[PDB]
Amino acid sequence: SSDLQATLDPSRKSWVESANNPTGDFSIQNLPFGIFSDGLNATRRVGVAIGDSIVDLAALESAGLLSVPSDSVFVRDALNDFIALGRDAWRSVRVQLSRLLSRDDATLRDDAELRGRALIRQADAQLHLPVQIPGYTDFYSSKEHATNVGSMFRDPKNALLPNWSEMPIGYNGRASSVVVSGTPVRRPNGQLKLPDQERPVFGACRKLDIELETGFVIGAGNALGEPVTCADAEAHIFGMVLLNDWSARDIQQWEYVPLGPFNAKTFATTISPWIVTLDALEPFRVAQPAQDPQPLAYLRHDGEHAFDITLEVTLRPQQAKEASTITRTNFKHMYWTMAQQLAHHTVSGCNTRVGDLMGSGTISGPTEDSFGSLLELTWNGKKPLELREGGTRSFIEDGDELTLAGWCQGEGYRVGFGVCAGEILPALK
Amino acid sequence: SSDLQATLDPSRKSWVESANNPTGDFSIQNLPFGIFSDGLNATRRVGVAIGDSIVDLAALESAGLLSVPDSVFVRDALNDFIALGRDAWRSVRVQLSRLLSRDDATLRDDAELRGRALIRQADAQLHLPVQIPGYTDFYSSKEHATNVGSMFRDNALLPNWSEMPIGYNGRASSVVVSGTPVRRPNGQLKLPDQERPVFGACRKLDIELETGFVIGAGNALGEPVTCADAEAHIFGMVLLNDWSARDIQQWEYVPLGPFNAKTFATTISPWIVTLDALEPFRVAQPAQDPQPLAYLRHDGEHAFDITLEVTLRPQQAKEASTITRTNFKHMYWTMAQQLAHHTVSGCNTRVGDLMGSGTISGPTEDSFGSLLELTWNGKKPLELREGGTRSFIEDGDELTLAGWCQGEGYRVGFGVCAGEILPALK
Ligand SMILES: [Mg+2]
Ligand SMILES: [Mg+2]
Ligand code: NA
Ligand code: NA
């Protein structure tokens, strides 16, 4: 408790000097979890990012500097087993690590041999999907996004459907196609409905888009038939990643009535590799937007349940040397919180499991430079985006690399998410 | 080849006499795969149904009478076995069919092994047969889609319905094995008289009579499965009840599809009937008009003749009422077409994935696959042949899906897919 609070102290610094870079994502205050391997050891194992390096948790446990309840949960291809140990475990590990990485601590700092083994450069590492995802659910909880999208489908006056302000609507996504940052994404072929022709055609998607989102990861499940209350919801959440829900919008338009988006979504979803713990995000909790009408009782919660997470997306054409930023927004603008989303997810009795992934829905902000999709940013191509380094984009083109990035900004430091990147491959011919 | 064809011969019979029952599901021609434990060994392991008994595959492998490429038969799920591929499935099938044949004494007369390796179903507990990585549900009955659509339009079918096998991602986590009771969901309801929705018990709880097919070989992300290769990716089939809360669905589902109204429970039968065992019952699928795009086309026959029936029994009622009888052969889109369309944009599939057919409604009014259709949204409640009436499912009701392939004096059947409805939380 008091130990947990010390790990959030902005004044703390690490003897890993790169960790003290004021704009770096991996401050000693962060300590996110991932799954890595390296050139010396291709076995996947649990790692914690610090500065430009990674702490090998299995190595620290073997040396006796790190203990979890008693096979090692740190020698695993996924974080599931360690997450399943519960929140007391996550915090114990976080406090031990924070102590050991602290500049005033000598236990690991001054052990050159163990430090030469237990700390690995990210430049030497392979980062893998951090969890084995039992289920992936995606919501739609940005009022600005639903307004922007709905305005094109109807008009500003009728942008929002009545159920949208009564529930955090969502759908099951495809867990199998969630891939880690860096995985190339192939432009899908599919059925396209052209405005001139009576019957659909088969061809390459012409409206390939991102969806800027976050995903939170379930740390404690719930039994089938047993809802999670809104007040209890956040205690079930382990942490967060960045999430790009790649969308083929022309494929979506033709297939989606009435059972929802399907092939247009499931060809690829990318997440960042580092799970930033919900505890690490506590210093950035802020007041969520005001809801009108007041939702039904089961969706209500007192206090603050939004999080101040700066988000950015860059797009780099294949021939470009530098990427151009195409949007900047914040997770704090979402109309429905994670607590409310999970509460609604389970209100009818659906169960959840450790490692489940819950996408926020496209995060769109107040200003025209803060929308979370090219569909919004270019208003369906009516005003193509002029790229800072050169070129124009309506939707994504072949060889474009799309990079999501995110951080919480504190006083003199950051708690950041790394990157969620993918580069588009030409459709199959 | 010759070896496999001998396992389909309707003339073959077992020394497990109950398997020779003409109306039994677990003939020697079936040999479906499941996961069981029993009173003597609580460890979950791979079993094959024969008559009223279960062949303990791990016990035979230990006894030397069974071989495959820790044993894949000592698992809580069929996934690792299925992952060995179709040669291994057929190998096991041929070996078991021989060992269970009326005249083979290798297993029949080894009493110390047979006492351990043949377990009565009555002394055994059956579990969910696979660890499901993904669950997809389709919508491929023209009769079903017509009846549903006919409730909002005259143009009952939308255009895209006849051009693709539309489907949606389901919730893998709430797929439960037959016999698991299902709690009626609470959710948001849109009442006709009130502007804002209310929270309360679901009032239109329904079944959806389906089958599910289980993937036996996946495909890489970005690499579609062609329609002509689709069936070689399919291990087997189960019965599937996609429980549905229709008033919850109507309010939530635009535009992202059904969600809370479906994910509270989906029941499957425990015995996976292999596609090989189903081969004698392959039949011609319905004629499609218009002709689909080329990637959805296949020559030959790709439907399967599967009798399906659903009973409803009120709580403490002695006799169940059969409320519908249909057949899988009526589905407009085949399993091959569903899998082709599922992957055509590059979605990947994994061993153990579950693919529901959608509600199976036939042409006649007594073959519809949901109470929504059988009662026309409650406008004509149905009279339980044993007494009482139903619009939608009431608390305590037990809904049982059953099914079999009818051969000449024998059956290749699926067992049952049952659940009793528990009251909603209060
Ligand atoms: Mg999305
Ligand atoms: Mg269904
Ligand atoms: Na996607
Ligand atoms: Na269901």
CATH number of A1-127: 2.30.30.230
Which amino acid appears at position A274 of this protein?
Answer: W
Domain B127-426 has CATH 3.90.850.10: yes
How far does the centroid of ligand 4 lie from the alpha carbon of residue B243, in Å? 4
Q: Does B148 touch chain A (CB under 8 A)?
A: no
Chain A environment of B348 (Cβ under 8 Å): 176-177
Taking a C-beta distance cutoff of 8 angstroms, is the pair A407, A415 a contact?
yes
Best probe of the A interface among B130, B137, B169, by most A CBs < 10 A, is B169
Peptide bond into B286 cis (omega under 30): no
What is the C-alpha separation between A405 and A395, in angstroms, rounded? 19
What is the C-alpha separation between B317 and B386, in angstroms, rounded? 9
B 362-401: CB under 8 A from A:
none
B345–A266 CB contact, under 8 Å: yes
Q: Where in chain B do CATH 3.90.850.10 domains reside?
A: 127-426
Burial (0-12, 13-18, 19+ Cβ within 10 Å), A273: buried
Q: What is the DSSP string of A312-334?
A: EEEEE-TT-SS-EEEEEEEGGG-
Using alpha carbons, select from B354, B358, B368 the residue that is nearest to residue B322.
B368
According to DSSP, the β-strands at B389-390 and B382-383 are antiparallel
Taking a C-beta distance cutoff of 8 angstroms, is the pair A423, A244 a contact?
no
Domain A128-429 has CATH 3.40.47.10: no
Of B197, B264, B344, the CB nearest to A348: B264
How far does the centroid of ligand 1 lie from the alpha carbon of residue A238, in Å? 21
Taking a C-beta distance cutoff of 8 angstroms, is the pair B128, B175 a contact?
yes
According to DSSP, the β-strands at A185-186 and A414-425 are parallel
The coordinates were experimentally obtained by X-ray
A348–B248 CB contact, under 8 Å: yes
Which amino acid appears at position B29 of this protein?
Answer: Q
Count Cα neighbours of B189 within 13 Å in the Cβ-side half-sphere. Answer: 17
Angle at A311 between CA A309 and CA A314, to 5 degrees: 165
What is the C-alpha separation between A30 and A10, in angstroms, rounded? 11
Chain A environment of B260 (Cβ under 8 Å): 344-345, 347-348, 350
What is the C-alpha separation between B326 and B308, in angstroms, rounded? 5
Cα-Cα-Cα-Cα dihedral of B91, B96, B102, B107, to 10°? 120
Q: What is the DSSP string of A373-421?
A: SHHHHTTTTTSPEEPTTS-EESS--TT-EEEEEEEEE-SS-EEEEEEEE
Output the CA torsion sign for B97, B102, B104, B108.
positive
Cα-Cα-Cα-Cα dihedral of B147, B149, B155, B159, to 10°? -110
Name the 3-class secondary structure at A146: helix
According to DSSP, the β-strands at B118-120 and B53-56 are antiparallel
**Count of Cβ atoms closer than 10 Å to residue A295 Cβ:** 23
**Fold designation for B1-126:** SH3 type barrels. (2.30.30)
What is the C-alpha separation between A250 and A254, in angstroms, rounded? 7
A 169-208: CB under 8 A from B:
169-177, 179, 186, 188-191, 193, 199-202, 205
What is the C-alpha separation between A152 and A160, in angstroms, rounded? 11
Q: What are the φ and ψ backbone dihedral angles of B146, each rounded to 5 degrees?
A: -65, -50
Q: Does A350 touch chain B (CB under 8 A)?
A: yes
User: Which residues are CB-neighbours of B94 under 8 A, at least 6 positions away?
Assistant: B3, B4, B6, B7
A 273-302: CB under 8 A from B:
293, 296-298
Q: Where in chain A do CATH 3.90.850.10 domains reside?
A: 128-429
Q: Does A352 touch chain B (CB under 8 A)?
A: yes
Burial (0-12, 13-18, 19+ Cβ within 10 Å), A414: buried
Residue B283 pairs in a beta bridge with B303
Count Cα neighbours of A372 within 13 Å in the Cβ-side half-sphere. Answer: 36
Chain A environment of B265 (Cβ under 8 Å): 224, 349
User: Which residues are CB-neighbours of B256 under 8 A, at least 6 positions away?
Assistant: A140, A169, A170, A171, A260, A261
Q: Where in chain A do CATH 2.30.30.230 domains reside?
A: 1-127
A176–B353 CB contact, under 8 Å: yes
Residue numbers in the known binding site of A are 138, 140, 154, 211, 213, 245, 252, 256, 265, 269, 362
Catalytic residue, chosen from B144, B233, B302, B342, is B144
What is the C-alpha separation between A395 and A250, in angstroms, rounded? 11
Whether B144 is catalytic: yes
